[PDB]
Amino acid sequence: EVSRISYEDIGGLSEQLGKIREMIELPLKHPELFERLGITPPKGVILYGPPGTGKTLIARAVANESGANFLSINGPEIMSKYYGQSEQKLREIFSKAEETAPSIIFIDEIDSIAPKREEVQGEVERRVVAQLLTLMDGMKERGHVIVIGATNRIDAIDPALRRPGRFDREIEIGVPDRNGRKEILMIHTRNMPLGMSEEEKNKFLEEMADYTYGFVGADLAALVRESAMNALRRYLPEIDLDKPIPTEILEKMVVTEDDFKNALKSIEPSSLREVMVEVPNVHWDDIGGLEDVKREIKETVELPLLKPDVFKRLGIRPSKGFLLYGPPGVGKTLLAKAVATESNANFISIKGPEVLSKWVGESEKAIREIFKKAKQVAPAIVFLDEIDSIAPRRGTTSDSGVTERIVNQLLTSLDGIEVMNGVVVIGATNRPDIMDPALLRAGRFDKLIYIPPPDKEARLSILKVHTKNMPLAPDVDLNDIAQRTEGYVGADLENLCREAGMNAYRENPDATSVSQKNFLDALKTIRPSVDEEVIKFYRTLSET
Amino acid sequence: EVSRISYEDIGGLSEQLGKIREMIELPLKHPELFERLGITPPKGVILYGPPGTGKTLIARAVANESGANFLSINGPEIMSKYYGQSEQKLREIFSKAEETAPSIIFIDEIDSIAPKREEVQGEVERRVVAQLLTLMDGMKERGHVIVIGATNRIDAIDPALRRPGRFDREIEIGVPDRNGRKEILMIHTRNMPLGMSEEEKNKFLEEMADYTYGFVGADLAALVRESAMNALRRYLPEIDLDKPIPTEILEKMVVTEDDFKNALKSIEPSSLREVMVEVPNVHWDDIGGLEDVKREIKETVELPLLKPDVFKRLGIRPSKGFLLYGPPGVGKTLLAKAVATESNANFISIKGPEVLSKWVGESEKAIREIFKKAKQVAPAIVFLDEIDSIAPRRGTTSDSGVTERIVNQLLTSLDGIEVMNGVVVIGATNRPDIMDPALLRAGRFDKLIYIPPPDKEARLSILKVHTKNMPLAPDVDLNDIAQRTEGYVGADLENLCREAGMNAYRENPDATSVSQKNFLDALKTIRPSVDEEVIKFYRTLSET
Amino acid sequence: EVSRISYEDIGGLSEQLGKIREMIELPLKHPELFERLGITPPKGVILYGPPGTGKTLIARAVANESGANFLSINGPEIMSKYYGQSEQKLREIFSKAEETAPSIIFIDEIDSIAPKREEVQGEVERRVVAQLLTLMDGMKERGHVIVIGATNRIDAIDPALRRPGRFDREIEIGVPDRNGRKEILMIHTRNMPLGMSEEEKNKFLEEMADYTYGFVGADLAALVRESAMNALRRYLPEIDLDKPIPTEILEKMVVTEDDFKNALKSIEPSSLREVMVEVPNVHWDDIGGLEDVKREIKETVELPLLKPDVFKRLGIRPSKGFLLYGPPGVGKTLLAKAVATESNANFISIKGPEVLSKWVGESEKAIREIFKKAKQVAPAIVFLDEIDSIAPRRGTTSDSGVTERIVNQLLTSLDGIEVMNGVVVIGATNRPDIMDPALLRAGRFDKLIYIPPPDKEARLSILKVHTKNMPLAPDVDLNDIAQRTEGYVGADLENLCREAGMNAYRENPDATSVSQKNFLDALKTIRPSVDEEVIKFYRTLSET
């Protein structure tokens, strides 16, 4: 190849690349190791990954990493060639391989050549499928050619092409790690203006890029393409004026860093199918009271997220998660989110009903991918709110395959938490009893965080924080309204401050800051919600 | 102009249109700048949105917003010709592109020329998919061939052709902004007369346009078509008097503002997709009872839509909807129906049984389409009547797919309403208890409107309003019967006045205006629906 | 393999392989025998059991011992197709069989291709059943179109497909026996370097082997593959030393025992309907306290299970089970788990409440499924926790079907016990009296092991063992708290030591070897759990 692509080009994948090195690259260099000792290396290998990683470019750099003769044919063009001018291609490349060994047979998107499992029937489809299949069979298990390929998905070929001994060693390459992304974007920075070497800009760009959880290799490259374009807008008022182009601009293109950030705004980062909320901004300060809980929540979360290691030095075994239980949505969701904000750790909130209506086709594989995605996005806190909803008592009869498929997959996936994994499960539920106790058994949830309903003192604190948006009148006395009744939860008090506005807008035709009277009327509008019957329910349920 | 369209002739899409200009037109003019500093051009753009509604016209005006060869071919005829000669058809045009490049290759319906990845297969289909794939590869750095195209839907394409470096640039062009819409409709006004110079009429057309719920380019133009028709009605019993076209009126015809006003509805130009069941006709004044509720319910729907701004001076909150719950028999639907007539925003109604039977072949996709369509058609009020019927308890176990399919989709879709969105949920149920408590969790119904049964004082107003139609004798004492019993519901007092008539018609076959006696007998024919025991059920149920 | 896996290559299936051998293989060798004497063997054969284990390998070796043309079709792809094209697939293969006959037609998951006996809810379902039926009917003997089929569910297939002729012969195989694994792993060992031909390695391979009692021939083989891979890592920094293979290591690499061990973590060969239970690892010696119970329980379980032989010479039939009973969770499960640790046998735990509530419209089928799941997965020891929960007294007036459904099914299924399996029924309960005494009658629980809660003296032992991992200041003595108090249960004292850690880690942000005070604060956080009231109850109830 004319422009040989060293590791450093697709670099930042080094973790994953070390797999590749040790897996496919070694036999491709000298098979003698595996040939002499242990199982024969598979000569068909697929690099599987979430669609795109600059698909081709990944394996194109593995080709030249081994330095093996970069024989390329690609799926679109494999079936482009005429009937029986397709057939001679394959054989020609393979023969050219056998001569030039090490030779990396690089065929990509082999899903495109052989798609449907058996719903393919095509003339050429069986011809070329067979040819490659047979070209795989014909081999010398010392003839230094391997066949690398890519696909977007494991199921995306004929089972014949998966058949053991014919494409079967498997390598997953996902979304690049935050620092790794820098390397990639750095390589693309070589073309780009930044104006100077600016290790500082590089560091800025580093955290700039971390401002998004990710973009894939291709997508990263689009971010940079955007910057250029976007920055060319900045220079659109200056340049246009000079109808014949000036070469004075040759260093009057120096992208302004804010351009990158502004391109970052609107570029639809990544292309992930499922929602991936990052870390919310809700500070501990924004929580409605519960200073005590904060001290405890910090030590509960922080020990697992921040420092597993030192506990193994003692010899104690940390927990495997926790559940929140108490009066429904006291800003439950806010408590969880809060702890996650202050922790750098990504938060994932995938709503309990969402997953229960979401399946990969009435099939639990979506949940198994949820945990997978969580593992991948780690350090992170997966949050399942209404965990009851995703796993009620297995005695529920609405469930049929719900329990078999998903609840048990959930079970094993919750068990899937490991000390090495950075995931932490913050479950939250309104009524525990509804939930399947297997999730409350050892090896899963361990503690149930009771939330006392809003105290008089805490009403004040939820109130100051909430009314931060609203303008208050000199007339207001905030501690008064708190003291008027503790009879509310946080969620209604949200609406309380709101409802004050609703009343108020009627009162003052054009709005003027909420007043004691505006609060009073609204106080008597909302019904109390802190049932002394339910507090006792949880009080007694605190035994369990 | 009409022949020889250019953006300035008709656009009004300017934010979006500005994308097109700045994207493909900019490099195409002076590439020397961008070639040297920054990005190389893209090679394909797909225009996603409401179909051929401006899609074509955009590129049709890139025939004068350019002058680069507007090589026009369209998908249906591209793939037809004498099997296996079809592929060379495409290619011939591509070659003819390179010669005449700068050339704007204009192909539309890149679904007909873009099947699904593997889901769709077909000889010609896979043939042409590959060809186009290779035609994308055929693009050179030197190249100056640009490809614009349109398709029915985003997902209708082959993701391979989506994959960057193959139709890398993608532009979705949405429903036009309120302020933008004015431009569109104004420009389309050019041929027809209005009033005088009337910046005021232009401004009327502006606010007219915010009075229009949002109309796509076509729909806006349909207003213009209507006006023609409507104003021609005015001239209808004048013009067809003789065989030649009159000159006494030929531009001494006048298209008055009122034509527009009658067009504004009453020909429902929000034909923005999907079937929307026909309107009633009643306005809140014409409905009686629950004046208080009316004042708030009105304020819930009207306030954001009619005046977002004054509520923002206080500070807005979401107000995603409300549920109506109480004793049935005020005609739940009638309260709802009232608001929907009067509301400026479009109303969306998907009646419970319809959606609940939309499991054709097991396709929950329909509920998922409701919200999707709602989002697109926003600002709007979606209406769910007997929401229980579409979403009972998720503890139901008579389900096949029933909970999984629809109910859980409902969940995720209700969460799917965003604060920025103008979609609002007007729920109705007779019995809350039947619906899953998760829906009675906040943010999946912001406030819960208890309907207390009609007060005596309100009975007077509902009753008077209802008997307004009836011929009424002076023998009546309407406030008397109102004051006699609150035991009726609204449905009953309707029937009270009805049954009175029945008594009366029997009594005097010859017409007589209804009398007190006609009310008395009927008073004892109908009976109180209301049972304070049942009121107590709902009264207690107001704490979920 | 190269020369396909010969009959003699596979083994440990000797009971079964000898069946096949003696059945289809004999005529295929010399037909002359059967040609002279009576009818020739049939075509259909069913392999019942957990799959892929040897399913394939059986028929993969038929070829080497009969010259049959191994030809396959597999369940997923048979049923993929479109209507009326599913049928022709099979038939096409049958004709292709006849050409190449003798042909060992090998079909797997034949449940999937004939999923329902009469309860078919599909076209294709009825299609393929008929085809296969007809594929049996056309019959050619001379062309030995021998068709072996396999399934994971014995009775899934239509009785028609099991008919005399039409798969008359059925031969069941399952997860290998302990000794059988050795054979299997031994044959697979010939291709790799153990570290010496050494009888010791064979013996090592034996105790290595007991960790599965023989789970899946394929899985076993993957385990060895893991070792290889792992060992190639060990020599990876050494193969890094030289690209041309050294003569020092030209495969004078040794696959060290630690490799085997390191594969042992993370390969999970427990795959037989992986529900099972997680592996216990606390031998009875590692079990704290209750030295007395251990001594008696050990001789009770171990004598029949570990030494079947000495029991058979007597001729006394093994126990039908036993009960463990004591105060709520002393780590009841740990006693059970213990029994399972020392035994090779798989452990099964299905909790009493969990099974009992599956009353999804009322469906006892779950209790009935327990035993079913157990019976198949045997050798295993079932533990049922809270026998009270699955069986109360039947004398209460709140019983209807409660007793009939579960308790008697439980009853009949417990009697259903097979002593020709490694099942041992270990019941556990809070209060014995609560259960119906019939389960305490013979044919079920034979003896009743009262588990008196731990003593102070046992507290001494539990405390040291548990904190064995944890570090400890030499100035602080454990025996101080042990001799001090004991109300605390053992399961709680577990958490005591845990919580001690939590407190201590809280104290110093740097590691410590805990203080007495660090134990104290948590000591009083936990409450006592030996109510002298319940102990006297059980003590007196020992006279029941």
UniProtKB/Swiss-Prot annotation, chains A, B, C:
The keyword ATP-binding applies. GO terms for cellular component: cytoplasm; intracellular membrane-bounded organelle. The keyword ATP-binding applies. ATP binds at residues 49-56, 326-333. Optimum temperature is 70 degrees Celsius. It comes from the Archaea. GO terms for molecular function: ATP binding; ATP hydrolysis activity. Keywords: ATP-binding, Nucleotide-binding, Repeat. Homohexamer. Forms a ring-shaped particle. Belongs to the AAA ATPase family. CDC48 subfamily. This is VCP-like ATPase. It comes from Thermoplasma acidophilum (strain ATCC 25905 / DSM 1728 / JCM 9062 / NBRC 15155 / AMRC-C165). The gene is vat. The chain holds residues 183 to 726 of 745 of the full protein.
